[PDB]
Every structure is written in structure tokens, then in C-alpha cells.
């Protein structure tokens, strides 16, 4: 927003968007993969544990 | 030199009047009020009007 | 009235004879000048244009004039002749051209001035013929060179001599 | 630039402005031969609607409408520029508050 | 541009004033969506209810408020404003009907109630009531009528009406809609109505989330419809 | 012009008249206002 | 009088249309062929006003295509019209004939295994005509080129790169080197 | 200009699932091929703006 208009005039003001549900469980199981975990962990616990 | 000299090659767009994108207003103005003046000497002067500038 | 007057200070300096450039761009000025002009007073104002077109061997100002809308503006089958008239303009084909003193004819109707239109073409036409018997090389009978454009000695003598 | 009150203060004067004419925003006829030069910048293959938005408040956002509708024809992979091409150009703009004051 | 900070209600250079332009969407803070459609002899209003708790309740959550036994509302936006403007509604046109004897044509009260929105924007130091309200009614000699009142004290009134937060695409769908010249058959009414918020949302959901006023030139009375025959309307519509 | 003169040719004319006054010449006349080069260049230019 | 943008109307400008007779009276002989249409043709300002005057016109139309026939026809005109014309009564002479050698100067430059009897036609019955007048105008020292009457020739020839652009060399570089050779003779003697 | 690190590849941060293809869409589309804009002859674009926490 702090750039002048006479300079935001840029094809458009593509966005990431807010992480949900899936994604943010797409991007919490990838933080997740190379551990020396076990089929324990609970997906949806953290899902809505999350805002 | 001034870093650009004319920059000598051609530099020229080459374009003409209407390729413009929609300025009919100025494009007419400096069609006729330059192209003419920039290298008349008695048009001006056919009615005494002046040598122009900026 | 002043619309009239400006298709006249173009017609007239085609007439008075400013030249094919200048009285063509006045034929602009005419075009884009008919902004809510009677059909009539405005598919007739295209007529001699795009007859004046068709006869400058170039409409030269394309994508401002022909790109423009006006020509596909008009109701009458009147533009859609000069739809075709335009097409002409674009290829004037001497394979299309000159056969088409007939398909033309309609159009040779509305002419504005008959001393220059196609005249000037065929003038051009002349040497554009020239190019085509004497290109293949420097010297060359007279009357085979000109067995192509099948007068062997009419008028490609003193055409030829003023070239 | 954006701005000129910053100045005529000795250039628009006697002896200074010997030609000085100002050149801002035009009427119009311009848009309409804009779109026929940037719509053609596109394809617009034969028949793509072309005073739906002349007349429409939607040259600088002629470059980004060409961008986003040719570029996504593109991301459809083909020439052929549609009608629908100019509404794809017409939506991801400057269209904050649609579309009237109200008062 | 400001530059002057638009806190109070000025007129700030080339031209316009900010209050009034951040009041209009006090409405889209509301996160809800409203649809009036006036076709032929009837009227009909449709809004849907974002409930998602089960110990909330269901009878209560109502946004149709009957104004008078024969003029219905609805609305959108904050929930304070939209209750104090209809009782505002209600008081004044219990005055009409003390003053003049007869029932209030809903045009006046339209009126009314964007003065009354106007003379809180005229003086400053009360903030302008950012909610709006869509109102229907019949009238006689002149049949059904859908008006639409802005928090500005603008009020019009049209044939197809929506506000809210999705009604630029609404308005373009009553557009694309209301071109063709076909009667209203009531169920053209409904039938459209419930299309048009299945288009703009895109849910096609139970019939317990919308609410639906109706009124008639058969029972002039405003009535607001039950889930049976909601759910009638809903699996007519369903081909 | 008559100012210039007067300030200008005064420095320049009769040196006896104002000399036998016994008392300074001037410098500076601030020849300032509305933007005065060109005639002010062109006129003592004679 | 190349103005033609400032002598419209003149109490000097007995009538205008008068100027253009004494400008085309020097025009049809200054201007060659490109200074011709320069002028005549492309200097259509002239031609608004002489739009009056046609025949003088024609005549400078058919003075492009070279049609000679037209030419003797007009030639015959603007001569008795000469005759009959102020401050030209002693010296009209030769203005029409240095037409007809200029005109055939460049008819025989089209080419050289050409007849004047072909041409005859063009000339007229010319024939005896232009026997005689290119006999006196050859006699003139004019127009080289080659004719006959047995075999009635016509040439394209003297080009001036091929010795004369090399003799105005010592044309000169004698006449004027004997010119400073006895200049400096007296000198010294 | 050098010191860029090479990393994953562009499927690792979700949420952009559609930006994905919007991104390559002016991300790939002149750098795989200009000649499309040939056949087209649409003038490449310089860029975009982004925008987040």
C-alpha cells in the first residue's frame, strides 16, 4: 500500500492467501515428514487446534 | 559529450501519428505545430507568428 | 453544413488538387468527421471515400481508418459494396482489378473524378508492366517485350520514351 | 509528470513561454481506437464485442487488460482473444467500490 | 487526497466526503446477503441466516421484521442500527396512523425514514446508522412495491433489489435475468429468487438457512413462509 | 528607463556634478518585480 | 516570379492572368522537365488562376508526353500570339524555333534507329519542313544527332563524358593560362 | 545476483495451490517461450506485486 499510485498502476497484486484447513494441514504434515516419528500423530487435533 | 548524443543510431520508434494510444488532442497539436514550425522559416512568418520554443 | 464543407476542402484539394495524401486525409477527417450523420448522408459519405481509397493505390492510414468502426457502421448494402471496394483498396489486383471494369462498374458509378482514379493506376501499372518484359534482362525486341502488354508498338513506344 | 502546479512560475511568461502548450487528458474517440489498437494487439479473431466497454467505466490499463486476458487465453493455450476476454481484464482491476458514489 | 483525516463530516477537497463512503460498508461487516424481486401482482424478500452454533437458536435469528400488518422489511448490516431503524419504522408509522387515519403507503415511509438518516448526517456528532433496509408492500392503484433505503437518506426503489455483500454480482445476475419479458408467475418469483442466491453463493442447501417474506395481491397481509412449504418451493425448483 | 538613466548615467555622465556635491555614488538599484532581461539587457545596451 | 504568393493582385499587376502569360512566356523555356512540373504541375497555386488560361496550359501538359503534333499546332499560336504581344516585337524570333530544337532534342534521345518521316506525322507533313529547319538548325550549331534523306536517321549521341568534359579542360586551362601568361609577360615585358 | 541458494522445488508451501499455476502462468510463460506472442503478438508484461504477513 505504500507505494504511490502513479507507480501501482504490476499486472496485479497476486496474494498468498491465509493457509486453512487444508492447506495449513498440507503445510503442517510437509514440516513432518523427515521425523523419527510413528503413525501416532493426530492431524485433526492440530487441525482445529489451529487459527 | 552529454552522456546520450542523440544517441545517433535509430532511436526512432518508428511510428506515426495515430499508432499513439488515443491522444488526438496533442497528437494533432504537435503534428502540425512542430513537424511544420520545427524546419519552416516563412509559414511562422506568413503570419509573422514566432520562432517557438519549449 | 461545415461537414459538407470539410468533404470539400478534401474533395476540392483532390480537385483544386492538393494531393492524393492530403485530400485523403481529409477523406479521414470526412470518415471520422460522420460522427451521427444520416445513413443516407453518411453511406454515401463513405462512397466516394472508399472510391478515392480503392483509386490511391494505397489506403496508407489503416489502423485508424479502416480500423476504425464507421466502416462497419452503415446498414445499406451500399457499404457492403465498399466492403469490397475496401478489400480492393487492401490487394488491387490486376488479376482482380482490371477484369473488374464491370464488378466495378456499380462502382464506377459513384466515381468522383473519372481523369485520375483508375487512370493513375494503369499509369502506375505501365511501368509495374515495364518491370516485368524488360526485367529478365537489358535489351530486348520491341515488339515481344511488348507482345505481354500485347501492343507491340500503340502506346509502349512513347510511354517508354518519356520513362 | 503527475504534477505541473509546481511550476509556471517564470516559464509561463512573457519572453519565457514562446510555444508552451499544455497537453492533459483528451475527449474521447481516443478509447475507441485504443481498443482497436491494443484489442488488436490481442487477437480478437473475428467477431469480440468492442463498445461494451467503450462506453463502459472500467490507455495505461489497456497494457494490463491485453496482460491479463491474452496472457490467460495463453494460460488457456490458444490465440482465438474473446468478448470474455475483456470482462477477464475487467475484474482484476481498479474496480474498489462498484460502481457509483450512490449520493 | 486525506490528508485531513475524515473524522468528522466535512467536505473534503475533489469532492466527495469519507464518512458516508465508509458507512456503506458497515453493511459488509453484516456478512450476509439480501435479495428482493418484484415481477408481477406479488413481492418477495429472501435472506439467508449464518447460524453455526446448535445452542443458539433458530425462532430468534430472524432478519424479516413485519413493520405493519401490511408492509414487511429486511435487513443487513449491524444488528443494533437495523433493530433502532425499525423501531423507528414502527413508531412512525403508528404516527401516520394516528395523524392521517389510514394506512401509510410504504413510499412515504421510505421517505420518512432517509430524512430521518439525513438529519443524522446533516448534524454532525451522532454516527449515521450504517445498516440498510429494503422494504416491500402493496399498495392499491398502484400494486406491489420494493424500495430500498441507504444509510445517506437515498432512498429509490426498483424491481429486482438486492444489498448486502455479493449484490454487484447479484445485480448482475438480475440484469442477465430481468431482460427477458416474461410474466412473474409467483413461482417465477420464488423460483428466480432462490436461483439467483444459489448462483451468487453457490450452496444449494437445506431449506432451514434462508428466510422468505412474501406478500400478495390475494392477502395483502405480510407473511413469512413456513419449512414445509419452503422445502416445497426448494424440490419444485430441483431438476 | 528615466530611473536608469538617473542611477546608471549619473555614475556614468557628469561625474563633475555630483563630485562637486562631494558625496558617494550608488551601486545597487535592486531592479526586481514581475520576471525585464530583455529590455533591461537591450537598453543601456545602446 | 517562382513567388506566386505574393503578386495576386498589384496595382503593378496590370492583371495577374497577364502575370501568368509572362511567366509561362519564360517558364515553358527555364524549367526543364523536373523545374517543368515542379513549377507548372506541382506548383498547382498557378493553376487555380491559370485554370483560365487552357490553352498555354494544354500546350505545357502535352510539353511532358512530348505530343508534337499539338506542340506545332500551339507553336503556330503562342507565335502569332508573341507577334502580336508587347516588348517582344524585335526579338520573338527564336523562342518558337528553340522550342522545336529542344522538343526534338529529347525525341531523338528515346532512341536512334528512328525516322523523322515517323515523326513527320508528329511534325505535321514535316517532312521538307524539318528538312530544311534541322538542316539550318544543325547549320546553327545545335543538337548533335544524326538524320538523313535517303535513310533518314535519327540518334542519341554527344555525351559529355567522352572527350568534352575533358576538353573544357584545356578550353580553359589555355584561355586563361595564355590569359595570365601575357599578363605576366608585361611584368617584366 | 549470487547469492541465490538452491532449494525445493515449487511444490513446498501450501495455501497457493491455485497461486501455483498463477505464479507460472507469468513465471514460465515468456521464459519458456516468446514465440507464442508470434502467432498472438501480445507485448510481455514485467511482473507482478505480492502482498501478505
Known amino acids: ?51 | 559529450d552529454s552522456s546520450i548524443m542523440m544517441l545517433t543510431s535509430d532511436q526512432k520508434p518508428d511510428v506515426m501519428y495515430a499508432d499513439i494510444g488515443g491522444m488526438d488532442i496533442q497528437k494533432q497539436e504537435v503534428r502540425e505545430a512542430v513537424e511544420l514550425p520545427l524546419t519552416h522559416f516563412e509559414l511562422y512568418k506568413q503570419i509573422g507568428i514566432d520562432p517557438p520554443r519549449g | 453544413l461545415q461537414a459538407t464543407l470539410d468533404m470539400q476542402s478534401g474533395i476540392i484539394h483532390a480537385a483544386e488538387e492538393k494531393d492524393w495524401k492530403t485530400a485523403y486525409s481529409y477523406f479521414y477527417e470526412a470518415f471520422e468527421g460522420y460522427d451521427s450523420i444520416d445513413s443516407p448522408k453518411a453511406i454515401t459519405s463513405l462512397k466516394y471515400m472508399l472510391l478515392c481509397k480503392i483509386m490511391l493505390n494505397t489506403p496508407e492510414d489503416v489502423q485508424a481508418l479502416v480500423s476504425g468502426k464507421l466502416a462497419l457502421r452503415y446498414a445499406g448494402r451500399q457499404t457492403e459494396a465498399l466492403k469490397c471496394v475496401a478489400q480492393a483498396s487492401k490487394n488491387r489486383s490486376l488479376a482482380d482489378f482490371e477484369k473488374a471494369l464491370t464488378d466495378y462498374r456499380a462502382e464506377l458509378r459513384d466515381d468522383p473524378i473519372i481523369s485520375t482514379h483508375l487512370a493513375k493506376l494503369y499509369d502506375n501499372l505501365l511501368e509495374q508492366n515495364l518491370i516485368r518484359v524488360i526485367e529478365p534482362f537489358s535489351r530486348v525486341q520491341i515488339e515481344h517485350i511488348s507482345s505481354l502488354i500485347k501492343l507491340s508498338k500503340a502506346d509502349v513506344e512513347r510511354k517508354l520514351s518519356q520513362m | 509528470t503527475n504534477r505541473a502546479d509546481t511550476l509556471d512560475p517564470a516559464l509561463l511568461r512573457p519572453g519565457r513561454l514562446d510555444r508552451k502548450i499544455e497537453f492533459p487528458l483528451p475527449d474521447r474517440r481516443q478509447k475507441r481506437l485504443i481498443f482497436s489498437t491494443i484489442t488488436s494487439k490481442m487477437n480478437l479473431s473475428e467477431e469480440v464485442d468492442l463498445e461494451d466497454y467503450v462506453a463502459r467505466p472500467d490507455g495505461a490499463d489497456i497494457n494490463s487488460i491485453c496482460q491479463e486476458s491474452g496472457m490467460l487465453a495463453v494460460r488457456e493455450n490458444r490465440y482465438i482473444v474473446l468478448a470474455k476476454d475483456f470482462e477477464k481484464a475487467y475484474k482484476t482491476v481498479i474496480k474498489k467500490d462498484e460502481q457509483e458514489h450512490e449520493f | 487526497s486525506a490528508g485531513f483525516d475524515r473524522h468528522i463530516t466535512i467536505f473534503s477537497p475533489e469532492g466527495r466526503l469519507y464518512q458516508v463512503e465508509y458507512a456503506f460498508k458497515a453493511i459488509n461487516q453484516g456478512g450476509l446477503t439480501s435479495v428482493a424481486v418484484r415481477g408481477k401482482d406479488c413481492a418477495v424478500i429472501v435472506t439467508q441466516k449464518k447460524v453455526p452454533d446448535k445452542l443458539l437458536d433458530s425462532s430468534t435469528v430472524t432478519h424479516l421484521f413485519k413493520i405493519t400488518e401490511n408492509i414487511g422489511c429486511v435487513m443487513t448490516g449491524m444488528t443494533a442500527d437495523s433493530r433502532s431503524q425499525v423501531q423507528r419504522a414502527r413508531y412512525e408509522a403508528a404516527n401516520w396512523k394516528y395523524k392521517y387515519g389510514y394506512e401509510i403507503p410504504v413510499d412515504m415511509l421510505c421517505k420518512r425514514i432517509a430524512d430521518i438518516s439525513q438529519v443524522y448526517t446533516q448534524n454532525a456528532e451522532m454516527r449515521p446508522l450504517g445498516c440498510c433496509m429494503i422494504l416491500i408492500g402493496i399498495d392499491e392503484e398502484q400494486g406491489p412495491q420494493v424500495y430500498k433505503c441507504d444509510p445517506a437518506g437515498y432512498y429509490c426503489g426498483f424491481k429486482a433489489t438486492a444489498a448486502g455483500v455479493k449484490q454487484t454480482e447479484s445485480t448482475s445476475f438480475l440484469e442477465k435475468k430481468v431482460k427477458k419479458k416474461f410474466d412473474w408467475t409467483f413461482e417465477q418469483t420464488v423460483e428466480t429468487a432462490i436461483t439467483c442466491l444459489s448462483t451468487v453463493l453457490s450452496i444449494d442447501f437445506k431449506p432451514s438457512e434462508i428466510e422468505v417474506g412474501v406478500v400478495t395481491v390475494e392477502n395483502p397481509k405480510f407473511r413469512i413462509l413456513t419449512e414445509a412449504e419452503i422445502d416445497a418451493h426448494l424440490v419444485a425448483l430441483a431438476e | 528607463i528615466k530611473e536608469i538613466k538617473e542611477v546608471i548615467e549619473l555614475p556614468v555622465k557628469h561625474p563633475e556634478l555630483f563630485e562637486a556635491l562631494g558625496i558617494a555614488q550608488p551601486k545597487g538599484v535592486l531592479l526586481y518585480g514581475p520576471p525585464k532581461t530583455l529590455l533591461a539587457r537591450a537598453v543601456a545596451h545602446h | 516570379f517562382l513567388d506566386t504568393v505574393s503578386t495576386f493582385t498589384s496595382y503593378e499587376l496590370m492583371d495577374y492572368k497577364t502575370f501568368v502569360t509572362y511567366t509561362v512566356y519564360v517558364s515553358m523555356i527555364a524549367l526543364e522537365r523536373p523545374d517543368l512540373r515542379e513549377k507548372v504541375i506541382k506548383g498547382a497555386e498557378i493553376l487555380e488562376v491559370l485554370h483560365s488560361l487552357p490553352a498555354v496550359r494544354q500546350y505545357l501538359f502535352s510539353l511532358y508526353e512530348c505530343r508534337y503534333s499539338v506542340f506545332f499546332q500551339s507553336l503556330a499560336v503562342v507565335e502569332q500570339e508573341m507577334k502580336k504581344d508587347w516588348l517582344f516585337a524585335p526579338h520573338y524570333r527564336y523562342y518558337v524555333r528553340e522550342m522545336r530544337i529542344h522538343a526534338y532534342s529529347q525525341l531523338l534521345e528515346s532512341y536512334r534507329s528512328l525516322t523523322l518521316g515517323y515523326m513527320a506525322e508528329a511534325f505535321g507533313v514535316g517532312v521538307e519542313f524539318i528538312d530544311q529547319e534541322l538542316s539550318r538548325f544543325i547549320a546553327a550549331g545545335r543538337l548533335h544527332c544524326k538524320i538523313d534523306k535517303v535513310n533518314e536517321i535519327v540518334e542519341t549521341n554527344r555525351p559529355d563524358s567522352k572527350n568534352w568534359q575533358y576538353q573544357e579542360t584545356i578550353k580553359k586551362g589555355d584561355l586563361l593560362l595564355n590569359r595570365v601568361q601575357k599578363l605576366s609577360r608585361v611584368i617584366n615585358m | 545476483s549470487h547469492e541465490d541458494p538452491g532449494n525445493v522445488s515449487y511444490s513446498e508451501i501450501g495455501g497457493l495451490s491455485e497461486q501455483i499455476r498463477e505464479l507460472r502462468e507469468v513465471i514460465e510463460l515468456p521464459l519458456t517461450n516468446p514465440e507464442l506472442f508470434q502467432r498472438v503478438g501480445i507485448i510481455p508484461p514485467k511482473g507482478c506485486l505480492l502482498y501478505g504477513p
Open chain 1, 1 to 51: 500500500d505504500t507505494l504511490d499510485p502513479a507507480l501501482l498502476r504490476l499486472d496485479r497484486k497476486i496474494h498468498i492467501d491465509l493457509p486453512n484447513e487444508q492447506a495449513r494441514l498440507d503445510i503442517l504434515k510437509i514440516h513432518a515428514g523427515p521425523i523419527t516419528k510413528h503413525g501416532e500423530i493426530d492431524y485433526e487435533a492440530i487441525v482445529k487446534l489451529s487459527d
